[PDB]
């Protein structure tokens, strides 16, 4: 049987994205690129180097036309006509639109490429901004968080390819499955904030009573997402708010990488 | 003569382009160019001191954990911060975690597939294969059964239309040397080692609160709250889960990516005399176990002239003399300010001029050691150690070395390991004596809170005036990596990484003498200028990461 | 005539007390008796019809899910509901995962130790434990290196004096026929089989909530909410998590758990011509595909006179021929009322006299149909499909022979399932079949989404005044269990339970027939009365749950 | 190296505390048995039967006198002398007064050892009690659920093996890192609670947004327990609530097997 064809393309990437699947278990990564779908473009995985591996592009890209999703991690820096990031001696931007052309689906994955993410943050030295913003005229599938869980993302492809379209999107683009609801209106620490139990300092009292971080700086308030409920990797009870740490809210335009970890929720 | 370039190089993380001339077949001349910057350190600059280690964890997803710890130790030396033990234990396990992970998947995923056909696997007979490991390695998955089980993946792969992440790879080139057995045996290991570097993230997520991108430090310690008899907090039921998964990991450490480590050199002698990257290794001392940041269970230093008998030693990251050693320059590399600079007086100005073979031609930064080109990384990592006379890393060096005499009836001289196969070498006896290490401190944390210590974190004083100045060492992955804050009236005024790969990768200095990466690629034969396998082979074996080295 | 008694009968569930005469080495006329009563019909009783399945699924927590799932149905049938098809998915897919934990524990947690001797086990080869299974099976996990660390687990055990769990078994027993070879493959498959057992576990987790004890039923359906879109619900995401874990299952119990049926019989072929409980047969259909309650996967009925040429298809939970011939006897066991009731009817007025040979000496029913006496399980569903001429079953059975006949030269007639192996065969061959039910009804359940439907409730209305009575079947793990339920005036008026191991445990009945197991029992050998081995094997082979039984 | 030593005794049980232990990883049951405990006695798993069984227990009663841990799940009916629960000929409480006597340690694991559970619910026909009700004077640590968590067990009993003392305990003698909070005190849906969103009818709107379940009876709010925050089988995600029911209140006296599914909790 033939597998669905899946186009990588990372820009302005730390590779985190990828480095989600390796976390994944439904699919693990290995069932994922052997069984369900092909993974016919990805330079972190890839045999090929080189002039081979730009050969295995655009026959992908020619034999798969209309069939493939295409997925970008990274921002897309604008600045100075591109050359912040230049693979094989042209733009990322420009591998990119030509990708997008052919592409069944497109999907943002990671917030960098969601919104520009921390590339894009303070002063953003390389002009760097969101796939769809490259991408005007196309309906981007964002998948945000830094990353996020990567069933965010497999998910959402399964049902690409299971029932022959997208998930049901908010008005961001983004699966409501995973970012659908607030943090804060999904939080099990909920009822202490109710109240007014908080951490005040790391390894204090209240802090070690698994009481609400608000006042360490939480951003559930402001962050939408499926951090408290999917949580990570799988194993039970393993989110940063559980593990003790504030969310910083990286999912989200303007809260992550903008305000200060103790900043607090509200305060600009 | 002829110039080829490879751009991108794959199975690496981010993005690399190297350029070679080619005389005689073989190479004469290179050129490591780094292609993608964001502007990390810029990206800080202005922000409380605390805030720094969220968003610079985010120069390299790959090596997850790392710039986060070296972050908050920055920090924490700037402020003369004692990091309290508990902190400090909890750190250690994440970072020995991470990076049994990390060196599992570089040897498996990102580079077995230099060294083993694929197609030449489905040629293989699995009982063939699966006797030839016996008395070889006591590993449990090693079965004719297995092997055929893993042999009919490729072939169903194959077979389909669509061999995606295989396509079109060197099956069938002159260097690939395994016999099929051979070939299928570490296809195998390849799918075994994915179930493993799970089983080491877990550790890492049920410290750091998820992975990729850890969230549990602070400057001052680590946001996990010890407490045994509370709910929804570190107790004895969360460290219990802890420890089942460190449990987990050294069978596969132990027997069977040590052996294949073996394995591979066997088969490719010649591998132990090309590649030599630099004759001087640093590395930083990793793991400390008291109060006030040292007691580290690592040694680190400094060799010069490939002769470990000129062996420094650093065991402290407070030590002047590794801090006034190092710079970076731009001579050739796309910013404007040119001289050597050290990381505290650090500028990262763009100035990019395009490619230029004796201009400008990468994103990365050319360090040096007081003036001289270092190699960092596992290889460094273990010269320093071997010269250190730490009885456990010759020991574990000595058991590969047996089992490539077992193969071959040959050895391994010190002298062979300057070279791509020792380099990869370093990175198996660090991943092995990281389970030492994951066990270790698993049991000081577990001891130092039945002793009443449930201390995590000690507040930070941060004056609203005045200017300190900090730097973070840490031996990650590939290498020392160093994070240098400067702190004016409460923000960060500076901030610069120099980071292990922008060490390995860096493009020619102030002198013009080249990085390790160009050299390491001088005398490589080439059978392929077109498929040039042999010179991705060696870079492979520096393990690189771009956005780590470009930031 | 000697006496013996085996009290407390371990590696079951529950409290199990066996007696048996024994004249000339030959076991003569056995005894069956269930110690301990709870009173949970006396329970549930005067209560809202919705709250019974809650209270009355912990009747046991072995077979967990069956008593919920049958709870349910009989309050379903009661107040004439037609089930949700979602609901009914989501049902079989938790029965169907739960059974397939439940017969592996039961052949290797509770039942391998009869068969198998560790201590022999420590004598073995593993290189040749491991050869002899090659062209066997294609199990991935058969290797000698496997094989070894299983032996040093047991020699360690061996060398600490503790042997706890392990102690005083039948180690050296002249009934212990295997080789110490087979006796180390069957200990490493006990252990291989925990891990399998876990996913199944997984499996009804994801769906149920938790296990043991599963909490997403509702007399009307069930309480999982299906949204493919929806945050916190049953979204494609959990669903892929289930299937990750139904794909998990099968290779181990197609190359281990059926092999390894085979190879016990191959070692103890006698045991196909003893221990036959019944000539009569039943089970019901179960698995119900359609909107009605309906279309079950398998097929169930009766058969009498151990002749399969009688079958008589029963292909409804409504067929008034299977709720008609349903009784219980008290006059063996310490309950007032003695005559055979009709569940609706029936009553549980405890009367604890104390053991009596000829009087009353168990707290389990005697139940029987249209007045015979009757074995259900495995057997009994084996029995039924093959009679249907279930291709199936017939295939899958074959299959199981041919391990025999490869091992032995022989074959395995119908004639020879009616036996202690015949039984535990019945049990494997359910285990495979269940593994293609859990693939078709996940498949299932992800078409019938994709089609729009989302129901999976159905809200019952409970009269405020009137009688109304139900009766909920379902095949279990150990056999054909019911409940039933007469609502009066919007409240539970009677209910009684009639559970699988009720009808095979069962003291003599009315006329004073014994049950399954005091059948079973006559003509057992016995080596050494003192060590009676040979009794607990057969009546293992019964999977025998006396909180079940006596509830 | 030497184990320490468990005797487990099963009165009025339906051995749904002993099978939670098949789905513990932290550790294994095949880990606790070789490496974690030595389990001298155990009805269920002991290749001994019958007589031989009996002297094992006699055995290692009087080997590990005032060593072993003692674990008792099922109620204890006292009734008619004792009768309803016979092993070996004799009444359970007795077997249990015995095993008492030399105990290190003595857990109830599960709501019929810890207050009588399901057994001991409406006309308590064979006068079943808890653990603590038959050895009145023994400090016996209360491991409530039906069944709980297995880790709610097997950390207690790290604990005693590790720092030589019993985890912290409520009035009620629960541990508090398992039974310190009540679950609607630490869950998820707190905020839906909050706001008035709440499923009505099982498959409803709200239902199948994953609102709170309180007005389908969620004993949360009267229930102390983990259940939110370990949840079950570690697979992430898992527990009645989240699967779409509401607790039922089985870890808590007077709230499971009393009141009905669908009757309402009290809030404090
Ligand atoms: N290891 C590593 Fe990174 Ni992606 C490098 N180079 C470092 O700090
Ligand atoms: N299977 C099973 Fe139970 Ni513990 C019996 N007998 C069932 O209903
Ligand atoms: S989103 Fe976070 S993880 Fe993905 S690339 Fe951007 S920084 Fe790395
Ligand atoms: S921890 Fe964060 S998300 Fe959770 S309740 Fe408090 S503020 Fe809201
Ligand atoms: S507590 Fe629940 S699980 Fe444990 S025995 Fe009592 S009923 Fe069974
Ligand atoms: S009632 Fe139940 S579901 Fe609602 S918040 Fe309280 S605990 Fe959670
Ligand atoms: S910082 Fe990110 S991963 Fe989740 S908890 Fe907060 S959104
Ligand atoms: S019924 Fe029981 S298992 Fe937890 S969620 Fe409620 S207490
Ligand atoms: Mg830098
Ligand atoms: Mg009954």
Chains 1, 4 share one sequence.
């Not at chain 2, 047996?402 to 040959?410: E, R, S």
């Amino acid at each position: 049987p033939q597998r669905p064809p899946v186009i990588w393309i990372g820009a302005q990437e730390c590779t985190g994205c990828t480095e989600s699947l390796l976390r994944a278990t439904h699919p693990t990564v290995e069932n994922l690129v052997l069984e369900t779908i092909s993974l016919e473009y990805h330079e972190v995985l890839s045999a090929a180097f080189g002039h081979q591996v730009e050969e295995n592009k655009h026959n992908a890209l020619e034999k798969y036309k209309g069939q493939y999703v295409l997925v970008v991690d990274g921002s897309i820096p604008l600045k100075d006509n591109g050359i912040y990031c230049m693979v094989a001696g042209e733009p990322i931007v420009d591998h990119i639109r030509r990708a997008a052309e052919g592409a069944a689906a497109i999907i943002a994955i990671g917030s960098c490429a969601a919104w520009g993410g921390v590339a894009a943050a303070g002063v953003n030295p390389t002009g760097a901004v969101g796939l769809q913003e490259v991408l005007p005229g196309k309906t981007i599938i964002n998948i945000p968080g830094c990353p996020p869980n990567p069933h965010n993302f497999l998910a959402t492809v399964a049902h690409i390819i299971t029932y022959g379209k997208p998930p049901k999107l908010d008005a961001k683009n983004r699966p409501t499955f995973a970012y659908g609801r607030l943090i804060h209106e999904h939080c099990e620490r909920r009822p202490h904030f109710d109240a007014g139990r908080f951490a005040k300092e790391f390894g204090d009292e209240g802090h070690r009573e698994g009481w609400c971080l608000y006042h360490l700086g939480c951003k559930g308030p402001e962050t939408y997402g499926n951090c408290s409920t999917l949580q990570f990797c799988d194993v039970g009870g393993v989110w940063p708010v559980a593990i003790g740490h504030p969310c910083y809210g990286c999912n989200e335009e303007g809260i992550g990488f903008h305000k200060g970890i103790h900043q607090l929720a509200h305060v600009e | 003569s002829q110039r080829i370039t490879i751009d991108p190089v794959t199975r690496i993380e981010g993005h690399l382009r190297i350029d070679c001339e080619i005389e005689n077949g073989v190479v004469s001349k290179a050129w490591a160019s780094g292609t993608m910057w964001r502007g990390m350190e810029e990206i800080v600059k202005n922000r409380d001191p605390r805030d720094a280690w969220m968003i610079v964890q985010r120069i390299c997803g790959v090596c997850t954990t790392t710039h986060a710890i070296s972050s908050v130790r920055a920090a924490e030396s700037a402020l003369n911060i004692d990091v309290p033990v508990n902190a400090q234990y909890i750190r250690n396990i994440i970072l020995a975690a991470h990076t049994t992970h990390d060196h599992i998947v570089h040897f498996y995923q990102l580079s077995a597939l230099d060294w083993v056909d694929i197609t030449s696997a489905l040629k293989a007979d699995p009982a063939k294969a699966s006797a030839m490991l016996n008395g070889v390695s006591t590993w449990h998955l090693n079965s004719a059964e297995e092997f055929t089980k893993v042999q009919n993946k490729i072939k169903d792969l194959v077979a389909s239309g669509q061999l995606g992440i295989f396509a079109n790879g060197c099956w069938g080139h002159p260097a690939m040397q395994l016999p099929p057995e051979v070939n299928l045996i570490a296809v195998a290991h390849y799918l075994q080692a994915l179930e493993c570097q799970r089983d080491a993230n877990r550790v890492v997520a049920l410290l750091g609160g998820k992975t990729p991108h850890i969230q549990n430090l602070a400057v001052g310690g680590v946001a996990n709250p010890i407490n045994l008899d509370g709910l929804g907090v570190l107790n004895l039921e969360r460290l219990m889960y802890i420890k089942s998964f460190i449990d987990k990991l050294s069978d596969f450490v132990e027997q069977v990516y040590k052996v294949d480590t073996a394995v591979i050199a066997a088969f490719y002698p010649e591998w132990l005399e090309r590649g030599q990257g630099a004759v001087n290794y640093l590395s930083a001392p990793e793991f400390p176990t008291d109060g006030k940041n040292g007691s580290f269970l690592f040694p680190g230093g400094y060799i010069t002239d490939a002769d470990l008998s000129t062996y420094r030693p650093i065991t402290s990251h407070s030590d002047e003399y590794l801090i006034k050693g190092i710079q970076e320059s731009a001579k050739h590399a796309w910013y404007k300010d040119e001289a050597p600079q050290a990381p505290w007086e650090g500028t990262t100005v763009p100035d990019y001029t395009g490619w230029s073979d004796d201009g400008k031609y990468s994103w990365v930064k050319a360090p040096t050691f007081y003036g001289k080109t270092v190699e960092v990384g596992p290889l460094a990592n273990m010269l320093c150690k071997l010269a250190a006379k730490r009885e456990s890393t010759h020991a574990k060096l000595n058991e590969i070395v047996a089992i490539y005499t077992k193969l071959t009836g040959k050895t391994i001289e010190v002298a062979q390991l300057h070279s791509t196969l020792g380099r990869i070498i370093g990175r198996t006896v660090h991943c092995c004596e990281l389970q030492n290490v994951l066990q270790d401190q698993y049991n000081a944390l577990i001891v130092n809170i039945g002793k009443g210590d449930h201390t995590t974190f000690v507040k930070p004083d941060i004056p609203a005036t005045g200017e300190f100045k900090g730097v973070g060492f840490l031996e990650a992955p590939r290498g020392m990596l160093s994070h240098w804050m400067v702190i004016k009236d409460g923000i960060i005024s500076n901030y610069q990484a120099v980071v292990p790969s922008t060490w390995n990768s860096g493009p020619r200095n102030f002198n013009d003498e080249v990085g390790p990466y160009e050299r390491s690629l001088v005398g490589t034969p080439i059978a392929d200028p077109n498929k040039p396998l042999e010179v991705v082979r060696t870079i492979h074996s520096f393990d690189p990461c771009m956005s780590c080295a470009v930031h």
